[PDB]
Amino acid sequence: MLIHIGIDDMCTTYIGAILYREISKIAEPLDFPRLIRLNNGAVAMSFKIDEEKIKEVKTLVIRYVRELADINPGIVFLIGEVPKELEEFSLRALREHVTIEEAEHVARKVNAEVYGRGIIGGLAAIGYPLEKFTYELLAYRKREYWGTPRRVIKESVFYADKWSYPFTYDNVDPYKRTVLITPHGKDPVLVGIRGIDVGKILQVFEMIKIEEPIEFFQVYKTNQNT
Amino acid sequence: MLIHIGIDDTDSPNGMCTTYIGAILYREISKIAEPLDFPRLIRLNPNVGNGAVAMSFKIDEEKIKEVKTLVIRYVRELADIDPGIVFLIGEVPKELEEFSLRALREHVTIEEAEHVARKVNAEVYKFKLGRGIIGGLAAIGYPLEKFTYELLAYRKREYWGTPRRVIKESVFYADKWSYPFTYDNVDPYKRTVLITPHGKDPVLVGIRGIDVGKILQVFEMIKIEEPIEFFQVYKTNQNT
Amino acid sequence: MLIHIGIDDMCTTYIGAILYREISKIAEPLDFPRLIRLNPNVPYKTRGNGAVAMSFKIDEEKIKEVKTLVIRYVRELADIDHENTNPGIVFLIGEVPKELEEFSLRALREHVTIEEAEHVARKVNAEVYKFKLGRGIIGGLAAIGYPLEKFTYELLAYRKREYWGTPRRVIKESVFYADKWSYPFTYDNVDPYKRTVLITPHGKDPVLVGIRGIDVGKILQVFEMIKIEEPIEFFQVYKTNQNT
Amino acid sequence: MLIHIGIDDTMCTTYIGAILYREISKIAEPLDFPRLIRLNPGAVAMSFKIDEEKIKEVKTLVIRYVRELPGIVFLIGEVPKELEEFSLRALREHVTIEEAEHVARKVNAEVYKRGIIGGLAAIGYPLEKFTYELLAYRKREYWGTPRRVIKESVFYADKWSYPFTYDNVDPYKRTVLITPHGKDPVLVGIRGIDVGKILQVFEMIKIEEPIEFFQVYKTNQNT
């Protein structure tokens, strides 16, 4: 049995990462969780589960979303395969403006449980067809550093690239396919990397000079381009 | 030791045989040298003269001359079925790579190409004062960072300009992304597409895409009713 | 909804490929079809040793259409080649249960009985279509249940009927291929391993030539470089538990 | 131009190797991840693209870092058949120090300062088959102290299991944890064949101490 969880409106990707990590203890993920940006960051994730575990998953989820409140937040649950009506809503939510009403109507029609405009994102995140995506690895700061100046040093290094083998060593990259994300302010993300190749993300990741402890990091698949 | 070969036939009103000839070269030279990658098919101007082919081989110093000779011979043989060759030895230098990128994004002159060719020591074999030198250099110098695969099936000569015997069959393909979706599900993008030439073009049929697994699914499913000479996989700067 | 089709008891891979191509017209395949060999010390011909399966996504409404088409297609193939009976067909609906997965693993590592196969088939509700009391049921169940965690690609090209049992018209001249790992190495350098190998059948076997490898790009390099003198009916890519 | 660097000695080898790869990456273009070559089913090597002008700069750099922190082997140009063959031979059998220096001189390798067998074999090894090995390194202040790592028992995402039930059994473990003890500067490590699966595993590891850095290697070893 498939079960999907969507959340929208600690930022969303932080909590969504907690959920993904916790639920992976009791259920088999289909894939990395997904970060769906409406132009917005809603998060969704899918697990293979048995009938008898729905309650446990539901309870866990609302348990964690609350502790990380114990310090608007739309949770959406769907059992089974994403039906065409929901996929169509997601594609629609990303092309144009959709109302909370349209969202309520679609959740009822597809039998989602909806536990703030958070429902629009929770729903769309669940239904988003990731035929096209990039990876986005996000590292998170320990709470002691939130609001503290970011301690991370970007050193200029060359990377390894098959396509450049025939070229001279000073060959220049026509495209930056992998990019660093450098947040600011109370945001709990320390640093992140976006790209389409996992090995290339690793190359970048290992080379980043990180002078403060990463609480944890999470790889997402996102409808965002590099 | 790297040797690169660029073929381009622009000041050849008509033509059509460029990728066909490039495929024969790739196939023949693989007999004696080690290819770096599939050959590359480069279009200079995406607004549709501007179609060139290149390829890169590893080889020992002793056999550079032999590669050049074989190439000249095959193009000669293949041409005399009723041209434009560039060679480059060693790594592709920054300037030739920069030239390639420039050619892909704006009009360049023959004088600019001669300049680059002399600076990087490319051999423009028996130049005939055409624009073909531009495509040959641009093809050699193109870095395959962004590209798509393009598989092209070639017709036997006896079939050229004959009615095409191919059946496009409407089937579903195996797509990982749609696993969590219901059977009846909108496919948002088509990332793999057919090329369907008409008339005397020697290409029977082609496929352009980003993933080789998906290219193979499509290719095996194509009903080919005529026997083909061969097919060749190219990487190209074009998109779907 | 998921439907799996298994085939057992030459024409097995041929028939399986046709099944895979035809059902793709109406249902969404999960992956390339799978070719499952039960014993490496034994020939992947018949009987019961070499089997084929495939998995499709289809809506509840069309499940019966799939089964019906599969049977018609196998019936016809029997009619044409007049052999003249069906190879065994097995259907399973829904996910493959742990019981069937484990049977498939046990069948690859040890001898199993027809009774053991009947036992799992009843337990997981596989439909063994028109059973003929053979060992084929084992191969069909095993093929359906096999988890493709470890596998190898196998591209098989098939001959037109007129050419069957006619001397093969295919030539493999040596060429070098493009290999990333060889970049830092001098030109004169031999592979320590061959990861991609040719399959060259003989006699009346409908397979023209095949290729087994772990990498699709390399399979494609070897495939485009093969000189094929006779026309081929079609070719099919399988994933298999076999290795090079 | 290609330059190759190989090190080996009679723990700190992959650590020093990682530092070299990281520093040289600042001035030269790596061909690939560094390679870890174990002669018994060890030695590190790496390959960078430079121009003639940078040879001394790289050599000088390497020599400086290894001493601040063992045989060093350098080579310029493509790896010749003779070195590759020695590399392959050094695995499947026993080779003498003398056999190694002979091979070194024949292929114009520079042997700075065993041990050389390992450096040479590392440089020359054809890794047509390899696994990825991700290694996380402790800060020196933590070496020889109790490890701050928690193994989290989780399910991972796998394509092949999509059509099986939830209670499906995983027939092979293709990705495995490396858990050293004692003074070893490696905090923890992961070996697998798929970088995607490596990342899944890496992100779930609960790391309770500040690590110096981590390095991905390619290695001849299997799981």
What domains does chain D contain, in order, with CATH numbers?
2-128 (3.30.70.2200), 129-223 (3.90.600.20)
Nearest to B183 among C31, C58, C182 (CB): C58
What is the spatial distance between Cα C33 and Cα C31, in angstroms, rounded to a whole number?
Answer: 6
What is the spatial distance between Cα A113 and Cα A62, in angstroms, rounded to a whole number?
Answer: 12
What is the spatial distance between Cα D157 and Cα D163, in angstroms, rounded to a whole number?
Answer: 13
Q: Do C101 and D168 touch (CB under 8 A)?
A: yes
What is the spatial distance between Cα C209 and Cα C227, in angstroms, rounded to a whole number?
Answer: 11
Q: Do C176 and B30 touch (CB under 8 A)?
A: yes
Cβ neighbours of A161 in B, within 8 Å: 145
Closest CA–CA distance from residue A121 to any residue of chain B (Å) = 18
Counting DSSP H helices and E strands in chain A, the numbers are 6, 12
Cα D126 versus chain centre, distance = 14
Cα B130 versus chain centre, distance = 20
Closest CA to C212 of C177, C241, C180, C174: C241
Closest CA–CA distance from residue C55 to any residue of chain B (Å) = 10
Nearest to B36 among A83, A165, A169 (CB): A165
Residue A87, exposed/middle/buried by CB under 10 A (0-12, 13-18, 19+)?
buried
The angle that helices D195-204 and A198-207 make with each other, rounded to 10 degrees, is 50
Assess contact for D83 and D123: CB atoms under 8 A: yes
What is the spatial distance between Cα D197 and Cα D223, in angstroms, rounded to a whole number?
Answer: 13
> Taking an 8 Å Cβ-Cβ cutoff, which residues of chain A contact chain D?
1, 21, 24-25, 27-32, 48-50, 137, 155-160, 164-165, 168-171, 198-199, 202-203, 206-207, 209, 213-214, 216-219
Alpha-carbon distances, residue A27 vs A50, A170, C96, D105 (angstroms)? 9, 48, 17, 58
Q: What is the DSSP letter of A145?
A: G
What is the spatial distance between Cα B101 and Cα B96, in angstroms, rounded to a whole number?
Answer: 9
What is the spatial distance between Cα B146 and Cα B215, in angstroms, rounded to a whole number?
Answer: 17
The first and second tokens of residue B67, run together, are 């590669």
Q: Do D203 and A217 touch (CB under 8 A)?
A: yes
What is the spatial distance between Cα D102 and Cα C21, in angstroms, rounded to a whole number?
Answer: 59
Residue D53, exposed/middle/buried by CB under 10 A (0-12, 13-18, 19+)?
exposed
D133: β partners:
D191, D217
Nearest to B220 among C1, C30, C235 (CB): C235
The answer to whether the Cα torsion of A201, A202, A208, A210 is positive or negative is positive
Assess contact for C239 and C151: CB atoms under 8 A: yes
The dihedral over CA atoms of B59, B64, B68, B70, expressed in degrees to the nearest 10, equals -60
**Token pair 């609480």 in the structure block, residue:** A215
Q: Do D157 and A49 touch (CB under 8 A)?
A: no
What are the percentages of helix, strand and coil residues in chain A, rounded to 5?
A: 35, 25, 40
> Taking an 8 Å Cβ-Cβ cutoff, which residues of chain D contact chain A?
1, 22, 25-26, 28-33, 49-51, 134, 152-158, 161-162, 165-167, 195-196, 198-200, 203-204, 206-207, 210, 213-216
Obtained via which technique? X-ray
Instruction: Write down the H helix ranges in chain A.
Output: 12-23, 54-67, 84-95, 100-109, 118-127, 198-207
Nearest to A158 among D28, D167, D207 (CB): D28
Give the chains touching B; criterion: ≥3 Cβ pairs < 8 Å: A, C
Closest CA–CA distance from residue A96 to any residue of chain D (Å) = 32
Assess contact for D43 and D122: CB atoms under 8 A: yes
The first and second tokens of residue B30, run together, are 């693989």
Cβ neighbours of C178 in D, within 8 Å: none
Exposure letters D198-219 (e unless 16+ CB within 10 A, then b): bbbbbbbbebebbbbbbbbbbb
Q: Do D203 and A213 touch (CB under 8 A)?
A: no
Assess contact for A3 and A179: CB atoms under 8 A: no
Closest CA to B217 of B236, B192, B181, B195: B192
What is the spatial distance between Cα A11 and Cα A65, in angstroms, rounded to a whole number?
Answer: 11
Assess contact for A152 and A31: CB atoms under 8 A: no
Assess contact for A26 and A53: CB atoms under 8 A: yes
Give the chains touching C; criterion: ≥3 Cβ pairs < 8 Å: B, D
Query: How many CB pairs (< 8 A) connect B and C?
Result: 88
> What is the radius of gyration, based on Cα positions, of chain C?
19
Cβ neighbours of B35 in C, within 8 Å: 176-178
Count CB atoms within 10 A of the CB of residue B38.
24
Q: Do B38 and C174 touch (CB under 8 A)?
A: no
End-to-end CA distance of chain B: 34
Question: Which of D166, D169, D195 has the most A C-beta neighbours within 10 Å, making it the best mutation to test the interface with A?
Answer: D166
Amino acid found at C165: G
Question: Which of C95, C182, C214, C241 has the most D C-beta neighbours within 10 Å, making it the best mutation to test the interface with D?
Answer: C95
Cβ neighbours of D47 in C, within 8 Å: 184
The first and second tokens of residue B35, run together, are 């290819």
- How many residues does the structure list for chain D? 223
D191: β partners:
D133, D176
